[PDB]
């Protein structure tokens, strides 16, 4: 019956601080319990506190403390998580969760959908399209690969399409890689008939909405 | 502070335990919790009280606890088990928190076994004009979800450069990754040819470029 909403992802760098909110839809938090708890990439599950607004009560890890604030607003039935002095470490997605009653110690039986914060120091920039082309080293059994490499941009995330979205099946886009230099790259075939290559008109759409850079590119032999 | 296996590996309609041990300020003295974390999903609740299912959870999950050890079972195992187990419980000492395991990552064995497609790019014309040099090897349709990328300039190992992506589960349900090799346009060019060697469930598939 209650969902649990949290606000947009994050993007921060090094020394700044985060406040992520969790509002108790179409129901409360008045009679509960509520924690928060985050999750590195690849990583386990880390409790960082948790508040009890009828006892007047917060509870935080040690590893957090000083640097976690948790709230709650009753008004709007909305508990808040702000942590502050952020690392590129503190990158993780962080989950709100309701307790089945009033105690910490009780079961967390509601969970809401995570927000993703992302530490770095890099800042915001669009890509670099480059046309991935296809040939004989790409073409076997009558179909050829050809695809956009989408490079250098920060941050997460890009979407791509090709023909507009016209053009669905056979498209394949990869998950993103992160360089050292601190800026993803990633890339989007399609696999087509080798025969239509002559006739057929080839383009990816890449969209950046963190730098608002939209990039069409037509890929060609 | 809680202990379970990092990984455990199953089949289709086999059983499977996992088992998570604490202490006694933690497990020894507090009900034992089990959350289900599928790929890109929050965590759901799978037991709680040690051994209580909450609504809409099937009965092929079972929890039990003695001592300051508590164990989850799933029989009938299905594809769609596949997830991250997490147990969590209370630890009562006077700084008090909650306390998780590190998680069982429950790989379920149930596809067919797939080779991986490799397709290598080379630098393109406009990237060298831009002064740089990306090779680009796509790797899909492979299944179970591992591989390991090498590279190579001529006959030998590079590995400055190199980003590899983790597999990520496709549509049909098998798996992609990505690698990726940075260069300079002098070092593309100085060589006779740079190689992608992708290894699957021991086996090798390679694909090479070469400077125009």
């Known amino acids: 019956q209650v969902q649990l909403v949290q606000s947009g992802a994050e993007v921060k760098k090094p020394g700044s601080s985060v406040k992520v909110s969790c509002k108790a839809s179409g129901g409360t938090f008045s009679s509960y319990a509520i924690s928060w708890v985050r999750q590195a990439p690849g990583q386990g599950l880390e409790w960082m506190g948790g508040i009890i607004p009828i006892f007047g009560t917060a509870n935080y890890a040690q590893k957090f403390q000083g640097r976690v604030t948790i709230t709650a607003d009753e008004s709007t039935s909305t508990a808040y998580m702000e942590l502050s002095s952020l690392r590129s470490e503190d990158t993780a997605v962080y989950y709100c969760?309701?307790?089945?009653?009033?105690?910490?110690?009780?079961?967390?039986?509601?969970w809401g959908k995570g927000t993703t914060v992302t530490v770095s120091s890099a800042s915001t920039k669009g890509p670099s399209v480059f046309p991935l082309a296809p040939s004989s080293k790409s073409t076997s059994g009558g179909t050829a690969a050809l695809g956009c490499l989408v490079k250098d941009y920060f941050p997460e995330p890009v979407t791509v399409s090709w023909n507009s979205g016209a053009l669905t099946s056979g498209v394949h886009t990869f998950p993103a890689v992160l360089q050292s230099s601190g800026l993803y790259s990633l890339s989007s075939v399609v696999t087509v008939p080798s025969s239509s290559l002559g006739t057929q008109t080839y383009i990816c759409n890449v969209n950046h909405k963190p730098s608002n850079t939209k990039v069409d590119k037509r890929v060609e032999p | 502070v809680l202990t379970q296996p990092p990984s455990v590996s199953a089949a289709p309609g086999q059983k499977v335990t996992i088992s998570c041990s604490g202490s006694?300020?933690?497990?020894?003295?507090?009900?034992v919790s089990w959350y289900q974390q599928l790929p890109g999903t929050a965590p759901k609740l799978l037991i709680y009280?040690?051994?209580k299912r909450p609504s809409g959870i099937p009965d092929r999950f079972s929890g039990s606890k003695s001592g300051t050890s508590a164990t989850l079972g799933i029989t009938g195992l299905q594809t769609g088990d596949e997830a991250d187990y997490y147990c969590?419980?209370?630890?009562?000492?006077?700084?008090?928190?909650?306390?998780f395991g590190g998680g069982t990552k429950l790989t379920v064995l149930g596809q067919p076994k797939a080779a991986p497609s490799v397709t290598l790019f080379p630098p393109s014309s406009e990237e060298l004009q831009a002064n740089k040099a990306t090779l680009v090897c796509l790797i899909s349709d492979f299944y179970p979800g591992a591989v390991t990328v090498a590279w190579k300039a001529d006959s030998s190992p590079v590995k400055a450069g190199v980003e590899t992506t983790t597999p990520s589960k496709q549509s049909n349900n098998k798996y992609a990754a990505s690698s990726y090799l940075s260069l300079t346009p002098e070092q593309w060019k100085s060589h006779r040819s740079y190689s992608c060697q992708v290894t699957h469930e021991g086996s090798t598939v390679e694909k090479t470029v070469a400077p125009t």
């Open positions: 009280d040690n051994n």
């Open positions: 969760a309701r307790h089945m009653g009033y105690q910490l110690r009780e079961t967390m039986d509601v």
């Open positions: 006694s300020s933690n497990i020894g003295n507090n009900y």
């Open positions: 969590g419980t209370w630890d009562s000492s006077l700084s008090a928190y909650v306390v």
